[PDB]
Curated annotation (Swiss-Prot), chain A:
Tissues where the protein occurs: Highly expressed in embryonic stem cells (ESCs). Expression decreases as ESCs differentiate.
Cellular localization per UniProt: Nucleus; Cytoplasm, Cytosol
Species assigned in the record: Homo sapiens (Human)
Induction data: By FOXO4; expression in embryonic stem cells (ESCs) is mediated by FOXO4.
Quaternary assembly: Component of the 19S proteasome regulatory particle complex. The 26S proteasome consists of a 20S core particle (CP) and two 19S regulatory subunits (RP). The regulatory particle is made of a lid composed of 9 subunits including PSMD11, a base containing 6 ATPases and few additional components.
Known function: Component of the 26S proteasome, a multiprotein complex involved in the ATP-dependent degradation of ubiquitinated proteins. This complex plays a key role in the maintenance of protein homeostasis by removing misfolded or damaged proteins, which could impair cellular functions, and by removing proteins whose functions are no longer required. Therefore, the proteasome participates in numerous cellular processes, including cell cycle progression, apoptosis, or DNA damage repair. In the complex, PSMD11 is required for proteasome assembly.
Family: Belongs to the proteasome subunit S9 family.
Name of the protein: 26S proteasome non-ATPase regulatory subunit 11
Post-translational modification: Phosphorylated by AMPK.
Swiss-Prot record, chain B:
Subunit details: Component of the 19S proteasome regulatory particle complex. The 26S proteasome consists of a 20S core particle (CP) and two 19S regulatory subunits (RP). The regulatory particle is made of a lid composed of 9 subunits including PSMD7, a base containing 6 ATPases and few additional components. Within the complex, PSMD7 interacts with subunit PSMD4 through their respective MPN domain. Interacts with TRIM5.
Acetylation among keywords: yes
Family assignment from sequence similarity: Belongs to the peptidase M67A family.
Name recorded for this polypeptide: 26S proteasome non-ATPase regulatory subunit 7
Annotated ranges, domain MPN: 5-140
One cellular-component annotation, GO: membrane
Cross-link (Glycyl lysine isopeptide (Lys-Gly) (interchain with G-Cter in ubiquitin)): 176
Residue positions where N6-acetyllysine is found in the record: 200, 210
One Pfam family hit: MitMem_reg
Curated annotation (Swiss-Prot), chain C:
The protein, known as: 26S proteasome non-ATPase regulatory subunit 14
GO molecular function: endopeptidase activator activity; K63-linked deubiquitinase activity; metal ion binding; metal-dependent deubiquitinase activity; metallopeptidase activity; proteasome binding
Record GO biological process: double-strand break repair via homologous recombination; double-strand break repair via nonhomologous end joining; proteasome-mediated ubiquitin-dependent protein catabolic process; protein deubiquitination; protein K63-linked deubiquitination; regulation of proteasomal protein catabolic process; response to ethanol; ubiquitin-dependent protein catabolic process
Coiled coil regions, renumbered to chain: none
Residues represented out of the complete protein: 157 to 310 of 310
Keyword NAD: no
Species this protein is from: Homo sapiens
Phosphothreonine: residues bearing it: 110
From Swiss-Prot, chain E:
Native organism: Homo sapiens
CC per GO annotation: cytosol; extracellular exosome; extracellular region; ficolin-1-rich granule lumen; membrane; nucleoplasm; nucleus; proteasome accessory complex
Keyword Ubl conjugation: yes
Similarity comment text for this entry: Belongs to the proteasome subunit S3 family.
Occurrences of domain PCI (ranges): 1-109
Residues represented out of the complete protein: 357 to 497 of 534
Protein name per Swiss-Prot or TrEMBL: 26S proteasome non-ATPase regulatory subunit 3
One GO term of the biological process aspect: proteasome-mediated ubiquitin-dependent protein catabolic process
UniProt subunit comment: Component of the 19S proteasome regulatory particle complex. The 26S proteasome consists of a 20S core particle (CP) and two 19S regulatory subunits (RP). The regulatory particle is made of a lid composed of 9 subunits including PSMD3, a base containing 6 ATPases and few additional components. Interacts with UBQLN1 (via ubiquitin-like domain). Interacts with ERCC6.
Length: 52, 286, 154, 94, 141, 182
């Protein structure tokens, strides 16, 4: 349920606990720009590809 | 005690014209004058100056003269014509730190408590900032003399002002490096300051001229810093200093990869903005 | 600046025009109308001037004023430069959403109209190349200056 | 004496170089960090210490020769990496 | 496309005589298009696709198991393709020829390696070219 | 001593120091000396030198206020024990990197489980950070993952270096002017 994060072992029951906020801000907030810009080049078809 | 000094370009210039006016002596003269200014908020300010009559004979070079009546009345005029202005200390033209400047400062400290000096340049060639200033500290201390006193450099820069920025930027009208973009840093401190580090590596090479042949006082308090520099020489390339360096190249270049991707689309939208003005006028105009 | 010098009002009474122009150097700078409302040119005249410039001084105000020492051999707030590389890019998404908006209302009302109309609000198109210069030189300088200290410092 | 490459000595070497047992060198180096004569870190399970800073001492006319030659090839390294910049970014500013 | 699309269906799989089930069904069609001499050598590329496929999936696999899955009919050269897989450089890790298992090391931090910058530097310089070509092809008026 | 740790305690030792007439007691001048300085002798080697002077002198009644009500004493025997079992754990976090579980319990002279209850209620108090183990007995002090602080502290060392190479340069050029000026 991700309320806690870790790992469970089956042989002897060892809970290796670790933590890091990895990164989220840098890539996916720059990834959605690419699919915004894809729709801009799609909208270039409605004033260039049809027109000239 | 003092954070830093602030020098205007007027007093920077107001020594050069006097260096021209005594330049007809030919043989030898240092320009020594009274430095005026108003230090506030623990920051040293320098505003105005003149120069006092001063001569020097080489045999027994401990004989100086300051015509204090010229110092009394002209400052009294300057205290009249600007009561905001006061004395801040003195200066000298400073090629090479002449010997009388150990007691010139002690001659006229009965006016300014922190009677600061300023060493300027008359023949400019460097890669740094050619204005230098010291401060007076004294010591009954470690090894040298019972009466010991050595000058210490407080950092120096040329302050600007809204009145004089009008003047100097009209007075330049010359080769300039404006339009700070991706290139001004490349030449103000990447072309230049790497060669600025030359003359500091080569400066301690010049003290190194005493290994068995140079001057007779040897080290004692010069090598504690030089022992530290090879000690504080940075970390070698074995640790995650390798790995976390590739980490941030793998982050900083992604922003450049996005930003360059945008640059191609924008000019392509500009390309259609010229194909709208090419085809839609050759039938219209001809 | 415009330095002046008087002319005789006695010759103003004579109606006689002074100063006997013998060189093609005076009538180069034109006077302002506001100075022409005043005594120019009925009691004084203008003088063309320039400035005496020399390596004695010109070299030593250029190579003395705008100079620095460490501002560039140093890094820049290393945990926050990469953080500032998101403080711009985050709204650059939605600013590109406006650029995913404004082109779509073209093939429309005669874009000279799209100059006068858009003066209340910010356009994407000019603002969208504004940060691209900023998101470049902040990165290319900071990447290059870090990769020289690896060579020079051990 | 050790170079700046490692300067990472072990507790057994102090047991050799000071002929003192293992259960007292940790009490020794905690004093040395407290006085301020040395600045480093202490591991206990791998039996090593990462000394970083040592107190500056004096030296004669021989150790300056070490600071002579170690300084001298650092001149050309500042020369060599800058020589790219005045050659590759030459047209960017004359 | 349907005979030729059925060919690359066999390539993305790891089966070996699936190539043979195509090359008898449409061996005559490929000679009409005049391309058979390039088709016949895909068996080198089928087996390097498969040995990359198996080594990435299984970590510690017996060499006397990979041949039965690739229908190789021989374990005694099942060592030997893996030798040419390392000689070409497909998989890195070692083979316990005494035991029989082929162990593989788990991958490590490929993010903190230089190689994604090489995915960038091809495309940084390429995307500045098309911005330059958009400038060079614009101001004809 | 008995106060919990604070910045207010960190100069409380200075406010009570600098006193000409406090140091007339030779014992109690050393008491505050022990807690300004380095690691303390464990608990038993101190009470054999200082758990006996609380009767002597002409000073016994606040020490009788320690001794007399034994439940007040039990609150003050153990809180004096609490500050000195803590005084190790401050500086062992500061000067060590990776110590074994058996080694720390030996410098506290108590059970290894009793050591774990001490490090439990201090890091849920988060006043000493630690990442202990109960399989290898390997604990470590001030060990985060450190993604960004490597190159950040490296960039700090450049600026400390570059500020120092400017210190010597304008200090050599005057030193040549006091031997060969004229």
């Amino acid at each position: 349920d991700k309320k806690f994060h870790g790992i469970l072992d089956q042989g002897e029951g060892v809970l290796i606990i670790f933590d890091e906020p990895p990164v989220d801000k840098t890539y996916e907030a720059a990834l959605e720009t690419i699919q915004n810009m894809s729709k801009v080049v799609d909208s270039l078809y409605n004033k260039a590809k049809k027109l000239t | 005690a003092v954070q830093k000094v602030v020098v205007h370009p007027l007093v920077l210039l107001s020594v050069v014209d006097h260096f021209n006016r005594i330049g007809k002596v030919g043989n030898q003269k240092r320009v020594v004058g009274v430095l005026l200014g108003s230090w506030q908020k623990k920051v040293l300010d320098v505003s105005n100056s003149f120069a006092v009559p001063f001569d020097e004979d080489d045999k027994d070079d401990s004989v100086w003269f300051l015509d204090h009546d010229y110092l009394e009345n002209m400052y009294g005029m300057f205290k009249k014509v600007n009561a905001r202005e006061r004395i801040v200390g003195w200066y000298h033209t400073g090629p090479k730190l002449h010997k009388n400047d150990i007691a010139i400062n002690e001659l006229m400290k009965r006016y300014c408590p922190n009677s600061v000096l300023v060493i300027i340049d008359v023949k400019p060639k460097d890669l740094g900032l050619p204005t230098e200033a010291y401060i007076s500290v004294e010591e009954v201390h470690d090894d040298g003399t019972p009466t010991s006193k050595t000058f210490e450099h407080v950092t120096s820069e040329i302050g600007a002002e809204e009145a004089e920025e009008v003047g100097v930027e009209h007075l330049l009208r010359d080769i300039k490096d404006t339009t700070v973009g991706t290139l001004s840093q490349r030449i103000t401190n990447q072309v230049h300051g790497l060669k600025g580090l030359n003359s500091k590596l080569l400066d301690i090479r010049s003290y190194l001229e005493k290994v068995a042949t140079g001057k007779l006082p040897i080290n004692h308090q010069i090598i504690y810093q030089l022992q530290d520099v090879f000690n504080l020489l940075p970390d070698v390339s074995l640790q995650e200093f390798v790995k976390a360096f590739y980490l941030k190249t793998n982050d900083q270049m992604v922003v450049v990869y996005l930003a360059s991707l945008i640059r191609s689309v924008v000019a392509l939208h500009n390309l259609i903005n010229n194909k709208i003005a090419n085809r839609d006028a050759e039938k219209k105009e001809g | 600046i415009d330095a002046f010098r008087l002319i005789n009002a006695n010759m103003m009474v004579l109606g006689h025009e002074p100063r006997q122009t013998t060189s093609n150097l005076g009538h180069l700078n034109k006077p302002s109308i506001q100075a022409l409302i005043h005594g120019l040119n009925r009691h004084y005249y203008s003088i063309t001037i320039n400035y005496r410039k020399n390596e004695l001084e010109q070299k030593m105000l250029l190579n003395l004023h705008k100079k620095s020492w460490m501002e560039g051999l140093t890094l820049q707030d290393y945990s926050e430069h990469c953080k500032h590389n998101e403080s711009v890019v985050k709204e650059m998404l939605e600013l590109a959403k406006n650029y995913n908006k404004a082109v779509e209302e073209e093939d429309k009302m005669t874009p000279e109209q799209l100059a006068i109309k858009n003066v209340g609000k910010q356009d994407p198109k000019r603002h969208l190349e504004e940060h691209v210069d900023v998101l470049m030189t902040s990165n290319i300088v900071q990447c290059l200056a870090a990769m020289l200290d690896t060579v020079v410092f051990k | 004496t050790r170079p700046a490459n490692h300067r990472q000595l072990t507790f057994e070497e102090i047991a050799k170089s000071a002929k003192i047992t293992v259960n007292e060198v940790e009490l020794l180096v905690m004093k040395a960090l407290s006085v301020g004569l040395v600045k480093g870190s202490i591991d206990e399970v791998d039996k090593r210490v990462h000394m970083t800073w040592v107190q500056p001492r004096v030296l004669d006319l021989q150790q300056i020769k070490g600071m002579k030659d170690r300084l001298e090839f650092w001149c050309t390294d500042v020369k060599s990496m800058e020589m790219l910049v005045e050659h590759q970014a030459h047209d960017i500013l004359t | 496309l349907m005979p030729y699309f059925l060919l690359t269906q066999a390539v993305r799989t790891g089966n070996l005589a699936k190539f043979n089930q195509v090359l008898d069904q449409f061996g005559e069609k490929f000679q009409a298009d005049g391309t058979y001499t390039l088709i016949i050598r895909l068996r080198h590329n089928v087996i390097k696709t498969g040995v990359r496929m198996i080594s990435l999936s299984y970590s510690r696999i017996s060499l006397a198991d990979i041949a039965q899955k690739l229908q190789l009919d021989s374990p005694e050269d099942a060592e030997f393709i893996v030798a040419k897989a390392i000689r070409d450089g497909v998989i890195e890790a070692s083979i316990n020829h005494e035991k029989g298992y082929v162990q593989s090391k788990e991958m490590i931090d490929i993010y903190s390696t230089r190689e994604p910058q090489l995915a960038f530097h091809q495309r940084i310089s390429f995307c500045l070219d098309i911005h330059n070509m958009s400038v060079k092809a614009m101001r004809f008026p | 001593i008995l106060a919990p740790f604070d910045n207010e305690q960190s100069d409380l030792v200075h406010r009570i120091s600098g006193d000409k007439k406090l140091e007339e007691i030779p014992k109690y001048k050393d008491l505050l000396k022990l807690f300004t300085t380095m690691e303390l002798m464990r608990w038993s080697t101190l009470v054999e030198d200082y758990g006996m002077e609380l009767r002597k002198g002409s000073l016994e009644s606040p020490a009788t206020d320690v001794f007399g009500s034994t439940e007040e004493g039990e609150k003050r025997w153990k809180d004096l024990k609490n500050r000195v079992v803590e005084h190790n754990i401050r500086i062992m976090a500061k000067y060590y990197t990776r110590i074994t579980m058996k080694r720390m319990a030996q410098l506290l002279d108590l059970s290894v489980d009793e050591s774990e209850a001490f490090l439990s209620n201090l890091v849920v108090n988060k006043t000493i950070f630690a990442k202990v183990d109960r399989l290898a007995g390997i604990i470590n002090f001030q060990r985060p993952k450190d993604p960004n602080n490597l190159l950040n502290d490296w960039s700090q060392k450049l600026n400390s270096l570059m500020s120092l190479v400017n210190k010597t340069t304008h200090l050599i050029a005057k030193e040549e002017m006091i031997h060969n000026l004229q």
